[PDB]
Design an enzyme around this catalytic site. Structure first.
Site, PDB file in Angstrom:
ATOM      1  CG  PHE A 189     -50.712-122.444  -9.006  1.00  0.00           C
ATOM      2  CD1 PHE A 189     -49.815-123.140  -8.042  1.00  0.00           C
ATOM      3  CD2 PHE A 189     -51.701-122.463  -9.298  1.00  0.00           C
ATOM      4  CE1 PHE A 189     -50.625-123.675  -7.104  1.00  0.00           C
ATOM      5  CE2 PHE A 189     -52.817-123.097  -8.388  1.00  0.00           C
ATOM      6  CZ  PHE A 189     -52.000-123.656  -7.098  1.00  0.00           C
ATOM      7  CG  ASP A 190     -55.197-119.137  -8.169  1.00  0.00           C
ATOM      8  OD1 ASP A 190     -55.315-117.750  -8.344  1.00  0.00           O
ATOM      9  OD2 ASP A 190     -56.399-119.784  -8.384  1.00  0.00           O
ATOM     10  CE1 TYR A 245     -58.781-118.461  -4.827  1.00  0.00           C
ATOM     11  CE2 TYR A 245     -56.598-119.561  -5.213  1.00  0.00           C
ATOM     12  CZ  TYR A 245     -57.804-118.943  -5.686  1.00  0.00           C
ATOM     13  OH  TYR A 245     -58.019-118.876  -6.926  1.00  0.00           O
ATOM     14  CE1 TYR A 271     -57.557-128.541 -11.340  1.00  0.00           C
ATOM     15  CE2 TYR A 271     -55.931-127.746  -9.837  1.00  0.00           C
ATOM     16  CZ  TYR A 271     -57.076-127.317 -10.655  1.00  0.00           C
ATOM     17  OH  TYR A 271     -57.661-126.307 -10.384  1.00  0.00           O
ATOM     18  CB  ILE A 275     -59.009-129.569  -5.359  1.00  0.00           C
ATOM     19  CG1 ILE A 275     -58.515-129.438  -6.645  1.00  0.00           C
ATOM     20  CG2 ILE A 275     -58.458-130.494  -4.655  1.00  0.00           C
ATOM     21  CD1 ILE A 275     -58.368-127.883  -7.114  1.00  0.00           C
TER      22      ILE A 275
END
Lengths: 290, 759, 48, 107, 310
Positions: free
Chosen positions: D36-37, D26, D82, D56
């Site tokens: 961000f990730d 991912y 989130y 999630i």
């Protein structure tokens, strides 16, 4: 001065100074705060000997008196037109001693300057100790509340051109210089003084609010950084409002490294980490990218 | 833009050289949650790429290196480093093979020490407990107190250790060319950031066996290669900033050498004590089973069988060195072995007298430090302090070995896991010490304390906890919280009780543990203030538990500590303690609950064991009644009301009246204060005519205390019925066993011969 | 008001007083016995 | 719920039925293109698990509606996400999430 | 059963304590003089302002920490080791058939060994490190006083001049204030404290005689340092102790010495009115009498050196 005892006596009345011997009560908690009263006999043990103070402290006292008089005149001049929107003919009556106060501020800033680091350890420590002693002498006899009153009376004006001149004239060029000199003197008075910074920590909220002034930010940031680095106890007193205000100051004044230094000071204390401030900075500054 | 452009755009480099500082200052000193958050901004790829990049500017290279250190290898290294001082070694066959090893294999034993830091060091050390960083987790909603505080973010250690060796190998190779273009701004930015990573990796025990050999060979290939080209880091000129870092590398090896020495000698004990135990059995059997020699063999048996084990070993070990007399019932073969081992230890540890090359660490570092300072005037104070702190250690190995012994301990197998679960909980308390008190830390501290208390071994090895600083750290935690801004009870309660509970439980196991805790009494008695110990313990509770029964430390009490309690009691017993007033309790100028629980400490400090210490009873009696405003002066005869009149109105306002607020009611507390006072006066009374008949001081104090409480009211108090046995009652007033404080006072003061024996 | 406080305030400017002889011209002579004075507190610029 | 737009054809008849641990790679980026990730930085697959979410739920169903070799560009709304609180310090509250999930199915 | 049936780990722990207190630290360290020897001879391996190897740098490093105020003195475990090593560089080598020739060899060896330190400013360090204590009676001033005795043993006319010149150069106050405060905190012989020990001994579990005075080494060393200051009839230093001209305050150390002697005289006189009735002196009483009288002799000698050289 070598243990030569003597008595003090009034010439007209002829009385002598002894202990007043008042009613003993724990109201004012005065260990020795007893009034000196001219008495006939007292206890026949109120002889006092003389000692001589040094040139440094004598000069400090004399400049304290002169600067106190000048500052009292300045604050009186400032409050004279506090509620007098004259408009046409902005100046009237007595004039503010702008030149004299500017020269006094510059001289005091030069007087209270940190010693250079290009000297040997012995003289460096001696000069540092003398500076600390003189700073404490100035701090005890006011001179901190005085400059605070000066700056917070001056800062009632913001535009610095028209709404600051609705109650004065010819002082338009003597506004920014006065504000900057006052901020520099405030910074230099508490620069490296643990006791002075601890005493000044009372108005940390005022100092934080003064950051978004756009006219005195350079000095206000220095004062805040110095008090943070010298009195590591207001970190707990720091709330989210102060952090948000500092971040907004950074966003308003653009990229800077003094702001990051101030945030680093707001981070871990003298050997103890402050997780509240750490998480506040983490959850405010950098989930908020760009 | 390319990040390398900051080598010219100085306006943005300065800002970015401080943003990195804020990155590693917002997650410093623990805070493993933020360190996980930072992994989303500076991922592993960026850090690894910046590690090997050679075109990065000076300040940014050091900023990125320390950011990686302070994110991944900071919390997992600080905990290991702090605890590394204490040595705990198990007794296993793997440890048995470990010896001091001055190498006698293929050569004499006085050979090279053998590359310190590559041994089989087997002291108990928990793992690092790393956690992988992810940002697609569910993030469940949980309370701050119940939050299982996060671990440090994970990073492949095998890749990091192999990489870090590569940069150091290249750096020491590229440094020999003396090129006019270092990796960073200068040679300082090229050698320092890589050295810091290596030093951080070394203390965590990540480098293997051959990895340490490469480090040792690269540091110095002349004395560390066993079986100018490739010169070591000690040869080429380096600035102070690089000399500082190499002093830390050699510090670790010296600690490695010391750890090897202490572990080996402890393992040597099981080899020697087993022979001694077998020999002692044979020596006793031969002397006892053969009684035909004489019927007066008790002289040769009392000194070897009717003595404490400490005297047995001390007398036995007093041999072999007592001016060639040896004065022992011990054979000659095993005596030689102990002397042989001592010479082996001395040769390895410093003294060996019994342009030369160093050939060992103890001489290489000593000559280097001497060479460093004689070449130039060292400017940085930190290097000057670090240089001599390392030189002095190597010039005196016995002192360091002697100082390490008190922290050395031995443990048998099948209990390492018991010790394993104790060190981890201890580390949590140590880690939380540098953090401001908070609900998350307070809850975590309680959980760690609770696990420590009844883990497996808190009772088995009390002497282990005498060392290791077990009690001092918990006390230090209490000191920080109890300070406050003139008030600390409101400042995070429910935790001081638990820490006091640990200290009280720490004193009940051994006398030495109680003796050590007694030394901290001046501060302990000073902060015995508000109390509010409705549950758990109080700051004065641990103080009482330190002198509960000593008969040796109770005599060592000073006079200021005793005079402080009564002076505090006088002020306590003159006011209403407005905390009680918060519940609507009636206002009286005397504290019934506070006074009752305050003098209970003196009841333990004056009644040592079934007796009355005359060295303190005379002092206690004088200061107790020195101030008339004590012992409940309102109704104790001092104010003119009388002690007998105190219990009269107390009963009328205790038998379930609706004239007080809601279990802390003005009932039993009103009359328990005087009962404890009567008991306290009874304890300090002279025992019997052993001092009463002979000395006149015993009766003089007896007469003084007799006049305080006349016998005319004792009969009235005891004659008052307790209560209706049947329906039942509670801790309200006049409990059935309340007829004990007055009874003991009658026994120890007045007595009965013929007059009172009837009524 | 004039106080008799001491101790820690012994090294401050409050306890600083200067002697002012009435001899205007030769004010620098030693303070003889019985010489009249105009003792002055410098910090507040006042006269006792 | 989520958007299941594809970037690669892949193969279809490899749906995750239940229980089995699926392996995905991912890359997660926020709005405005900010990222961000990304597991590609760590070179380690996420090793997704079904049932015991720990993730999630929007990402869970986005990965469920995928098969072998079918790279999916997920557009998770800030409802199955989130939430109104968001991940502190990484994901600001009330923001859509863009995912680049590619399932390898190493089981 | 102390013989057998004990766990091996517990037996091993018992061996560790016995071995540490019996075989270790017995007699063989002898590394104090070996340190200073190679610590100074290597000033320039291959070659003015460049100081000796650490000798004018290590001493200056400690002197620098003595000037930073900090309003207190740290534990500074590093100073414990070195201030003892330098002290034992001359004390350990303190130079009925002693001939003249060997006597001069001993005296010249001590003078050279003291010249190895006092030429590097070790005399200045002692004065600074004893002023920073400000009356603190901890282990900081015990090591400094011990070093100040070895560096002044025998009454060196050179070190005395260096110490006197430094005191009259800075003209600072605090060296005498700490000295005066250290005199007042000196303990005397106590009786009620001794009485408590008798009950405790009647039944570890004891102070080993360190409860009555317990200020034995420090009290003698404080006065020995003062006597060694004006030893060779140093007229200049004798006047300085009585009254300092450049300083703003006079302490009169001579009067302070008499004051401590007065308390010690009263203490021993009160101790005399304890064994007057009894004709037998206990062993514990004998040691206490020796402890007080030995200190009293040291005080008396210090008073003599203030007057000799009249």
């Amino acid at each position: 001065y070598g243990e030569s005892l003597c008595f003090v006596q009034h010439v007209a009345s002829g009385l002598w100074l002894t202990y007043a011997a008042p009613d003993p009560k724990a109201l004012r908690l005065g260990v020795l705060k007893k009034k000196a009263i001219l008495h006939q006999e007292g206890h026949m043990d109120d002889a006092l000997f003389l000692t001589r103070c040094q040139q440094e402290e004598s000069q400090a006292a004399r400049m304290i008196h002169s600067t106190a008089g000048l500052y009292n005149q300045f604050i009186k001049g400032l409050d004279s037109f506090s509620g007098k929107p004259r408009g046409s003919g902005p100046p009237a009556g007595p004039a503010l001693p702008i030149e004299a106060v500017i020269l006094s501020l510059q001289d005091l800033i030069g007087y209270f300057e940190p010693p250079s680091e290009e000297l040997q350890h012995e003289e460096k420590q001696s000069k540092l100790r003398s500076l600390r002693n003189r700073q404490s002498l100035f701090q005890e006899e006011g001179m901190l509340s005085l400059v605070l009153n000066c700056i917070d009376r001056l800062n009632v004006y913001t535009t610095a051109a028209h709404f600051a001149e609705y109650a004065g004239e010819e002082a338009a060029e003597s506004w920014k210089e006065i504000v900057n000199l006052l901020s520099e003197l405030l910074a230099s008075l508490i620069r490296g003084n643990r006791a002075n910074c601890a005493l000044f920590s009372t108005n940390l909220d005022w100092v934080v609010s003064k950051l978004d002034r756009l006219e005195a930010s350079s000095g206000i940031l220095e004062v805040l950084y110095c008090v943070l680095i010298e009195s590591p106890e207001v970190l707990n007193i720091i709330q989210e409002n102060h952090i948000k205000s500092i971040i907004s100051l950074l966003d308003k004044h653009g990229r800077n490294h003094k702001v990051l230094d101030v945030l680093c000071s707001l981070c871990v204390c003298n050997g103890v980490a402050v997780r509240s401030n750490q998480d506040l900075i983490t959850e405010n500054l950098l989930p908020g990218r760009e | 833009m390319d990040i390398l452009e900051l080598s010219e755009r100085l306006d943005l480099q300065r800002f970015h050289s401080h943003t990195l500082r804020l990155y590693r200052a917002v997650c410093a000193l623990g805070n493993n949650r933020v360190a996980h958050a930072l992994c989303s901004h500076v991922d592993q790829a960026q850090l690894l790429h910046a590690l090997e990049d050679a075109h990065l500017p000076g300040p940014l290279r050091a900023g990125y290196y320390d950011l990686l250190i302070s994110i991944h290898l900071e919390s997992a290294c600080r905990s290991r480093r702090s605890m590394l001082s204490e040595y705990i070694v198990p007794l296993t066959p793997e440890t048995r093979a470990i010896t001091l090893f001055p190498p006698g294999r293929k050569g004499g034993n006085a050979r090279r020490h053998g590359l310190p830091g590559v041994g089989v060091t087997t002291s108990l050390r928990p793992p690092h407990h790393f956690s992988p960083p992810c940002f697609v987790a569910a993030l469940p909603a949980a309370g701050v107190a119940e939050a299982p505080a996060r671990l440090s973010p994970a990073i492949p250690l095998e890749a990091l250790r192999d990489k870090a060796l590569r940069m150091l190998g290249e750096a020491v190779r590229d440094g020999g060319q003396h090129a006019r273009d270092p990796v960073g701004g200068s040679v300082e930015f090229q050698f320092v950031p890589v050295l810091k990573l290596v030093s951080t990796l070394l203390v965590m025990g990540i480098f293997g066996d051959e990895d340490v050999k490469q480090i040792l060979k690269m540091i110095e290939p002349e004395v560390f290669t066993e079986e100018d080209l490739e010169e070591g880091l000690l040869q080429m000129k380096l600035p102070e900033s690089v000399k500082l870092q190499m002093c830390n590398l050699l510090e670790y090896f010296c600690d490695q050498e010391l750890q090897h020495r202490v572990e080996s000698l402890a393992a040597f004990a099981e080899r020697y004590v087993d022979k001694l135990q077998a020999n002692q059995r044979s020596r006793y059997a031969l002397l006892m089973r053969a009684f035909t020699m004489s019927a007066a063999e008790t002289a040769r048996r009392t000194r070897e069988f009717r003595s404490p084990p400490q005297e047995q070993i001390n007398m036995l070990l007093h041999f072999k060195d007592e001016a060639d007399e040896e004065d022992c019932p011990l054979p000659e073969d095993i005596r030689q072995d102990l002397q042989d081992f001592h010479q082996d230890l001395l040769a390895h540890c410093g003294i060996q007298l019994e342009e030369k090359k160093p050939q060992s660490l103890q001489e290489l570092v000593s000559h280097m430090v001497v060479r460093w300072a004689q070449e130039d005037y060292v400017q940085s104070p930190e290097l000057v302090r670090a240089m001599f702190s390392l030189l002095h250690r190597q010039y005196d190995g016995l002192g360091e070995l002697l100082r390490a012994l008190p922290r050395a301990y031995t443990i048998s197998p099948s209990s390492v896991e018991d010790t394993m679960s104790l060190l981890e909980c201890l580390g949590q308390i140590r880690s939380l010490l540098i953090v401001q008190m908070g609900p998350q830390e307070e809850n975590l501290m309680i959980q760690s304390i609770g696990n420590i208390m009844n883990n497996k071994v808190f009772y088995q090895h009390p002497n282990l906890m005498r060392a290791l600083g077990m009690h001092e750290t918990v006390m230090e935690v209490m000191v920080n919280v109890l300070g406050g801004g003139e008030t600390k009870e409101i400042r995070f309660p429910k935790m001081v009780t638990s820490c006091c509970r640990f200290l009280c439980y720490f004193c009940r196991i051994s006398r030495q543990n109680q003796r050590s805790m007694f030394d901290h009494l001046s501060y302990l008695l000073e902060n015995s203030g508000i109390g509010l110990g409705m549950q758990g313990s109080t700051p004065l509770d641990v103080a009482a538990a330190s002198v509960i029964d000593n008969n040796e430390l109770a005599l060592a009490l000073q006079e200021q500590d005793l005079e402080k309690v009564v002076s505090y009691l006088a002020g306590c017993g003159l006011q209403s303690c407005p905390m009680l007033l918060a519940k609507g309790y009636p206002d009286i100028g005397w504290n019934p609950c506070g006074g009752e629980r305050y003098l209970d400490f003196l009841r333990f400090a004056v009644f040592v064991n079934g007796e009355s210490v005359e060295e303190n009873a005379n002092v206690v009696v004088r200061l107790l009644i020195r101030k008339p405003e004590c012992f409940g002066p309102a109704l104790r005869g001092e104010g003119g009301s009388g002690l007998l009149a105190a219990i009269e109105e107390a009963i009328r306002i205790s038998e379930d009246p609706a004239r007080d607020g809601p279990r802390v009611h003005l009932g039993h507390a009103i009359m328990s204060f005087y009962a404890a006072l009567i008991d306290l006066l009874g304890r300090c009374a002279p025992e019997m005519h052993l001092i009463q008949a002979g000395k006149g001081e015993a009766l003089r104090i007896r007469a003084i205390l007799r006049s305080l409480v006349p016998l005319d009211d004792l009969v009235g108090i005891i004659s008052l019925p307790l209560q209706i046995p049947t329906q039942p009652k509670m801790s309200a007033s006049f409990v059935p066993d309340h007829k004990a404080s007055m009874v003991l006072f009658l026994d120890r003061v007045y007595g009965i011969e013929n007059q009172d024996f009837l009524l | 008001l004039v106080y008799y406080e001491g101790g820690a305030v012994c090294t401050h400017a409050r306890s600083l007083w200067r002697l002012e002889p009435l001899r205007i011209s030769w004010s620098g002579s030693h303070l003889r016995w019985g010489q009249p004075l105009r003792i002055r507190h410098v910090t507040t610029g006042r006269y006792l | 719920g989520v958007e299941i737009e594809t970037i690669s054809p892949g193969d279809g008849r490899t749906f995750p039925k239940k229980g089995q641990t699926c392996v995905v790679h991912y890359t997660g980026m926020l709005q405005n293109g900010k990222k961000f990730d990304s597991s590609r930085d760590r070179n380690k697959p996420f090793k997704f698990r079904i049932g015991k979410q720990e993730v999630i739920k929007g990402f869970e169903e986005g990965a469920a509606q995928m098969s072998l070799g079918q790279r999916a560009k997920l557009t998770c709304t800030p409802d199955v996400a989130y939430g109104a609180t968001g991940h502190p310090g990484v994901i600001p509250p009330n923001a859509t999430l863009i995912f680049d999930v590619e399932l390898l199915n190493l089981e | 059963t102390p013989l057998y049936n004990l766990p091996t780990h517990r037996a091993c722990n018992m061996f560790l304590e016995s071995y540490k207190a019996a075989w270790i630290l017995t007699e063989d360290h002898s590394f104090e003089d070996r340190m200073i020897d190679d610590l100074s001879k290597a000033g320039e391996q291959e070659e003015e302002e460049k100081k000796p190897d650490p000798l004018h740098q290590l001493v200056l490093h400690f002197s620098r920490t003595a000037l930073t105020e900090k309003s207190k003195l740290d534990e500074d475990y590093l100073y414990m080791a070195y201030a003892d090593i330098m002290a034992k560089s001359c004390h350990l080598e303190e130079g009925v058939e002693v001939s003249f020739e060997e006597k001069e060899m001993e005296k010249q060896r001590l003078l050279y060994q003291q010249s190895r330190l006092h030429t590097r400013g070790a005399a200045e360090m002692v004065l600074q490190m004893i002023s920073a204590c400000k009356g603190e009676t901890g282990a900081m001033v015990s090591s400094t006083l011990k070093l100040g005795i070895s560096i002044l043993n025998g009454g060196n006319a050179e070190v005395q001049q260096k110490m006197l010149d430094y005191l009259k150069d800075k003209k600072e106050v605090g060296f005498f204030q700490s000295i005066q405060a250290l005199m007042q905190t000196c303990s005397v012989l106590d009786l009620n404290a001794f009485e408590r020990q008798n009950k405790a001994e009647g039944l570890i579990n004891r102070q080993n005689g360190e409860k009555v005075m317990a200020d034995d080494e420090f009290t003698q060393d404080l006065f020995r340092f003062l006597q060694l200051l004006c030893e060779g009839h140093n007229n200049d230093f004798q006047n300085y102790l009585r009254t300092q001209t450049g300083n703003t305050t006079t302490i009169n150390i001579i009067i302070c010495t008499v004051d401590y002697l007065l308390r010690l005289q009263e203490s021993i006189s009160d101790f005399y009115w304890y064994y007057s009735g009894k004709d037998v002196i206990e062993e514990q009483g004998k040691r206490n009498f020796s402890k007080a009288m030995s200190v009293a002799k040291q005080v008396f000698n210090s008073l003599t050196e203030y007057i000799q050289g009249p």
